[PDB]
Design a protein around this ligand. Sequence first.
Ligand SMILES: CO[C@H]1/C=C/O[C@@]2(C)Oc3c(C)c(O)c4c(O)c(c(/C=N/N5CCN(C)CC5)c(O)c4c3C2=O)NC(=O)/C(C)=C\C=C\[C@H](C)[C@H](O)[C@@H](C)[C@@H](O)[C@@H](C)[C@H](OC(C)=O)[C@@H]1C
Ligand SMILES: [Mg+2]
Lengths: 51, 1332, 552, 50
Amino acid sequence: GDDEDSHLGDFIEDTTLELPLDSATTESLRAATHDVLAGLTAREAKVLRMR
Amino acid sequence: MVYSYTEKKRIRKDFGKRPQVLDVPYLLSIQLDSFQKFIEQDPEGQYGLEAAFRSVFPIQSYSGNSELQYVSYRLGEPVFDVQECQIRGVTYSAPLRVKLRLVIYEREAPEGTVKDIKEQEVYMGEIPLMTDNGTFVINGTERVIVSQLHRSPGVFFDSDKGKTHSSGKVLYNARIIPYRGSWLDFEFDPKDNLFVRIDRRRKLPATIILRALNYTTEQILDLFFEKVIFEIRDNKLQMELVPERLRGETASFDIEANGKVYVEKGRRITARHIRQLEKDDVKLIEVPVEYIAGKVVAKDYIDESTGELICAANMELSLDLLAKLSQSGHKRIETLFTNDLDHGPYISETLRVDPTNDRLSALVEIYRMMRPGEPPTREAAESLFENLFFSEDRYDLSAVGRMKFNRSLLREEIEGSGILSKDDIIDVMKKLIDIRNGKGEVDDIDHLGNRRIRSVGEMAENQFRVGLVRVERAVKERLSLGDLDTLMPQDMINAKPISAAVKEFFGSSQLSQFMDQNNPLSEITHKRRILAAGFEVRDVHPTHYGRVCPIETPEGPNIGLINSLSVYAQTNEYGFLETPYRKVTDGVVTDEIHYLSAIEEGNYVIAQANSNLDEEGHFVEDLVTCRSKGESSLFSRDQVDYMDVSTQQVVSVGASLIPFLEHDDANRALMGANMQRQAVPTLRADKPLVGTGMERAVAVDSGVTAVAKRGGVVQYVDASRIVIKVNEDEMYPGEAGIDIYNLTKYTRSNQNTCINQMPCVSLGEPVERGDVLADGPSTDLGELALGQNMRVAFMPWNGYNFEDSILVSERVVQEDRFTTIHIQELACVSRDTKLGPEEITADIPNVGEAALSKLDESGIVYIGAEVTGGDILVGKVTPKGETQLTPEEKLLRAIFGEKASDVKDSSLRVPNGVSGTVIDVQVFTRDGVEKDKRALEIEEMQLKQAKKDLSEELQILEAGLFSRIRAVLVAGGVEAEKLDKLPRDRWLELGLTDEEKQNQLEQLAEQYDELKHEFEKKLEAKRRKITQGDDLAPGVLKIVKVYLAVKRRIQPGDKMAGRHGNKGVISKINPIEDMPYDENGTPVDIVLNPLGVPSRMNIGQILETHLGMAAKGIGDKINAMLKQQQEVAKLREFIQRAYDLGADVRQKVDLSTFSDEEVMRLAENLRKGMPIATPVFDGAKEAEIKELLKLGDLPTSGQIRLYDGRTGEQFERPVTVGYMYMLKLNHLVDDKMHARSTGSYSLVTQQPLGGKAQFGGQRFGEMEVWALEAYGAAYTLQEMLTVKSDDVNGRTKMYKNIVDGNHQMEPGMPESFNVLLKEIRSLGINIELEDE
Amino acid sequence: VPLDGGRFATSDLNDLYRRVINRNNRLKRLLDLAAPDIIVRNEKRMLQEAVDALLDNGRRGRAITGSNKRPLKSLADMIKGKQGRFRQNLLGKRVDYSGRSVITVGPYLRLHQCGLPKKMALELFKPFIYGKLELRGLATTIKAAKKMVEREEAVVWDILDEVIREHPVLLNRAPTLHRLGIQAFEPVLIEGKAIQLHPLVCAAYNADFDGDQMAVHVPLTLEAQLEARALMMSTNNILSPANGEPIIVPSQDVVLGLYYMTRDCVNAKGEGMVLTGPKEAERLYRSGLASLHARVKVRITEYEKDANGELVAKTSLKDTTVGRAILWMIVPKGLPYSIVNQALGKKAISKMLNTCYRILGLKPTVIFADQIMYTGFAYAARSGASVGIDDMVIPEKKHEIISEAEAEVAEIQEQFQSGLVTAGERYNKVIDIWAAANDRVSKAMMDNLQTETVINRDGQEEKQVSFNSIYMMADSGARGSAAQIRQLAGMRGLMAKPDGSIIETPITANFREGLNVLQYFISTHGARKGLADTALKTANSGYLTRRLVDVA
Amino acid sequence: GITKASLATESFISAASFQETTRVLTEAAVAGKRDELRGLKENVIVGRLI
Ligand SMILES: CO[C@H]1/C=C/O[C@@]2(C)Oc3c(C)c(O)c4c(O)c(c(/C=N/N5CCN(C)CC5)c(O)c4c3C2=O)NC(=O)/C(C)=C\C=C\[C@H](C)[C@H](O)[C@@H](C)[C@@H](O)[C@@H](C)[C@H](OC(C)=O)[C@@H]1C
Ligand SMILES: [Mg+2]
């Protein structure tokens, strides 16, 4: 196209990466389950963190 | 003639004086005519497949006396028809079946054949076909091939003065450009040495080619120079004197003969002395022995006794050399005639720089020039030189090349050999030297006689030619070793080689492009288009008159590199551009038309399109403005040979549609004709209120509308089809008939607009042949409506109209008049991956019942279901196994007990923000995979729908035929009530008394049964085409194409413009309450800023407003008398008054029209407004406009009082209000608008890239970096080129901080530079980052 | 990396690298096989060719890639390019948090703000919105926040007003030349898909409204917000860095308003009366008692800061008009009334803003500038200025002027037929008389057009500068100029044939009248050369800046 | 002249930008030239504060 320096390889997106709008939610889910596991008894947290 | 049936519906009031002698021809002529010449059976070398065949044929093997000749060709029926070919995606093409004859001559002949096998019509390739509208379908998409403009083959003599060497002196060069084969260039130098180079290669002394033609030095001087005869008679040097030789020279000695001294020494020889010598007939004079010291000897001279060469040809004689050749008995010495002014001694000095001697020497030095470095050989040099310009294979000028060649050389024969001859080369050199001598002139490239026009037909022939040469090598190669009777002309000729030459052109070539169809004018202005470097070629040339439009060209990187074809222009017989003209004999202007090419028109004196003649057509004025040779001035009454045909012929279809064009500056006029092609069609086809009269022609000539094949009365009118019962005078005897027009309904255009036809006629109405049956998109009752005219007011309104910005009343969007319908084609592909096949199944992980609602059991949205952004059009799921989740996700599924599927969701969903209704679904399936439920339902529907259509054909057709049988049976055997009782099927038995009517019943019988079976075969074929598995790409199992119809109205950001080049972007949509209104209380639709009018000089936009206002008046008035229901008399009276308008116009008019049914219908169509026609340069004048405003009841000033709808108070000064035609271009704001937060990223270098059609971020350029550098903003720039883009880490570390509420950046290094380090380090360069 | 349809695609280096290995490996083999010299020599050369082709292709044979004619791109070509490096050179990397669209007016804006389409802002600030939604607890977690904005729940719009309020955005146009090509604004949420841009800024950008599109950038980091506000902000650059003159100068409609405002006709409603102050002056006008322009003495209070850092006040009865009286309400403090007492053309109206800046400082000038725009648009709208076809007045003497100049050409022609003058001398002469004629017609229609308003105050007659529409445009400085006006009414010019010569039969007609076939055709070259010259010289200009920024 | 004066720049990373890349890299690589940044062009390439 266009004869411009745009070349086929410039259009191949990275599928093995992880989008930040997600990565943010991973760091959050850690904080989430870690909060909710302190709401239980020390053995329920230990047994659930173990399983 | 004298007015058609759809002309009785509405008539355009036409100002303008000049009567039209010629009416606009078919606008699509070029495209259709060209292709018509390519594919056709022509029994001769006239351009076509026949000609391209006859060139390379017959093909004989190598010395083997095995020859393959060509018989005839045929085009098989197309595999798919035009409509079907578009859906599937294949090309619309026909098989090429060519009969070949294989002869084998007995080895060691007398020439005779052992056996000759005639192979019946071997198939080579499928060549595309042109639509009835002049388009091609390459892959499912209508594409147009633009005609090209290039330098005509022939010889061309140029200057190259100025810039070279900066010494002046100019230069003179000739160039021989063949249609095929190498270029032959001749050129001078500052030393007046003639040089030659083949193609652009190394410069070589000119004479070196003559030697390769086997010409010795003696004949070169003898060819290019005259002979000065020197006689040694008695003793010491006499000389022959042609008395003209003394012009331009001063006597070098006593010029005396016949005992009388004519000229003394030191007296220059003027016309007086020459007369004396001429009239006294002085043949021989006495000259000194020293005058030949400079004279170059012509031929060779040897010593008769010693047999040794005294002096070689082309040597300057000296007083000592004269002695050595005199005692040998030489009476005569021939020398060159050399004059530095009249006849130049150029060739003589060219020979002294020539390194070669004989033919082999030149051939050696020539062969080593083209292919240097390799050792030359005699047979190699001979072969090369004969293969360049002398070989019928590698060189052709064809007809145009040879003609202009001979024509520019002042020859007689207009046609000749297609290769170069020694006579030809010599003549060209002669002409170049003559120009350098001062007699003759150099051509110019810009002249339209040297510019030839190709077109689809000519171009395709070349590609097919290329295909045949690459197949030729193969055929000879096989016929080399061939066994006698086993092989035949199939095993040799392949398909793929020839087919790929033609296929590579139409498929991808700079001249083959998507038709620009958002607009009928766009189509027709695309199909007429030309293509051709510095400013010389871009600029407008005097020869462009009547051929190329001066004002329609793109404004941008290529200006004047495109143009467009003029209105009346036609391709010349030889391929030049010729234009219509009127032959003026004696003092009368004769209406016989005459077509003159670019060179033909040159010498004649041509009058002006605008001129005054009368009665017999004698020029009124004693002198009239005319143009003769490349310039225009006043010319005497009776001199003029010809006159311009029409006032329009200078412009193009685009420019010819601008009313009052003569009043607009060319810049804005260009932009206008440039923008008019972008007008998207509207929901309600309106009509131009102000017009030219081309709009009718553009609408009809373009295929967008549906034109009557034959005249008659409408039998049936449906929004789908139209059936016309033909008149008997127009009807053919057999089959009887009716014409059935199947209308195109709502469907996707190339630009995603809506192209839909509407019936413009009513049940049982008389229609005449060549009448508009149905309007297309953006056409109204046979005229061309690219938009909708509306009430406009010029005044600054609180800055909302600030630059070009347009402020539009809410009334416009409420009336839904500028609303536009877009049809978008969305696709869903079920592919094949190594992990597994993708399913179109309706079972999608993680979607609610509301999501899957709009889908059927199969997973495809129902037809007609209205959707918005995000809705699932097609359910699709692809296998991805062993997800490999993490600890906390595993707990999540554990708590909520969800089984995470082995399949990932690929389903096709509606793009963000776009909302519409689903109008169609297509299912393509691989051959061999089972069609799912929905796909089968579609196939069944298509089957039933097909049967209904075909049956409809047969039903209406059969009745049409039997209705004729009823009429013929009543002649000769009339029984009226008796005949229609018995079953219609039993009618065919009754015969007739001896007459042709018995044979007429016979005719109708034959054709009846034919239809019965023709229907049958057509149904079968259609059914097979439905059920046959469509061929898909490798890897694709099935494809689902959904068609959405979005209806967008108008919103701030859309581009809008008038025909006069005034752009605009709608700013605010204002309530009707705030709209300026007049005393009568009627608000105004649009408020334009007046400030745009004076700067950009377009005054027509004002005139267009004024006349428009007046037009609406005549409309409004009728609307009152029709609402009064006065009577036919009052109405008739008032309308007649309008169509006359005070004096001298060409309109004529009524009282021939039927006073009741025809007149009342016309007025109903005029009540919206009175259509007016302003011819391009013949258009109306202020006075005519003011008078129409008098009839209008509206002021002459064109301005009235307006009141602000807010304060209700008046406006100081009157403001101009009227009706301007305005187009909606398609830039519409909800396309251009894009925004991105965090999208996908490119793999090779991590950078924002749109993969979802969620667009990649805006491109931040170098210039913008400077802008940040000028400000003190360092951090904005770092974040711009590091964290916001290129830093694969910094981006995520940033995003997390943005949600946490900490605005910071932990920048790191952009990955781009990090790659440059490895790329440098990949070489032998050690690049490190030092210190700390 | 794989592609759709299962096909693969890879860089050319592989094709190159592969080659270098093979030949190399083969050579290793050829040593252990004890091959003759002539072979291992050829293999070594082949290795040399492959390595050379790998590093920089095109300096020897130009090796071509497998099955594809186009030569395979080597490592040097990855760095190299047009020009130099691809990375920072134009262009130059895509950037997140951005967008773009068609632009419109938005005259209501203050100079420090701009209209931003709702949808664009939502997608732009997505991370800010996510983080703010769960900071106040309207969303449980970031995902739930995503679903909220993806659902476009009504509550999110108010949260966006928070992240938008103080948060500048960058606006950019296509040919960025000077630093004003990018400027910071405060975002204003706007329904609709078009960007609204303050008119006063339209000059610095060279942005028309004929459909030009503009780009938006979000300043993420805190330092960028403060850079934008303290550097790239609209209000902090009001002056061209090229010359101290204000670049915020009112453009066209606004100055046409003020010109029509402070102007005076000879006799108008309220002429001669006297008023206490500007307040009751507007009260007179708006109520319909007095005309906008009438000569009147009114008491005004002006200020001069000529003390030491201290504003002096002085009051007097100034002889002025009603419009100028009303306009004075905007002028802040220490400016003298002399500045508004004139006719206020586009030239004077700029020096007004300039002095205001050099006296009161920055802040007073900004709010001043805003007010000037608002009042300019407003009063221009009241004025009902328009342009009609009868607004262009042709001189009554034109046809006669053409005729007299037409006699001149035939005189010199008669002199050339008799050899009294040489061909070249004739051409220049004829060309001269036609040129002089153009000047004659120009200074005729200019006199007629300019002053022809002839009106009555209590006596017989008097004549002032015309109130005819098109003159006001050209006179005020809004739009149009004597050259363009000359083309509308008087004859237009003598065009030039392509070779650069000028045709000796000028265009005798104008746009108000019709041009015939020939006249238009001759006009085309000037148009065509005009468009071509600008379109090429535009690129040339850029090139100049390029060399300049490199050398500096 | 302007186009000639821009040729000389101590930082080679800047020169590799707007000049001919190949020659710049080589001619610097032999001398072992150590680019200290300190300029604008070069700092933009490497992506740090101007
Ligand atoms: C195969 O042709 C392609 C390129 C060849 O390459 C190349 C180097 O050779 C070209 C040839 C031979 C042209 O004749 C041409 C051209 O005539 C044209 C523009 C300029 N185009 N514009 C671009 C878009 N923009 C917003 C406005 C200006 C071009 O760039 C080119 C062009 C090339 O650049 N213009 C016009 O004629 C005018 C003033 C109106 C055009 C009508 C519509 C717009 C077009 O017909 C659209 C419908 C398509 O047809 C094109 C998209 C073609 O693309 C395809 C695949 O069909 C394109 C010509
Ligand atoms: Mg523009």
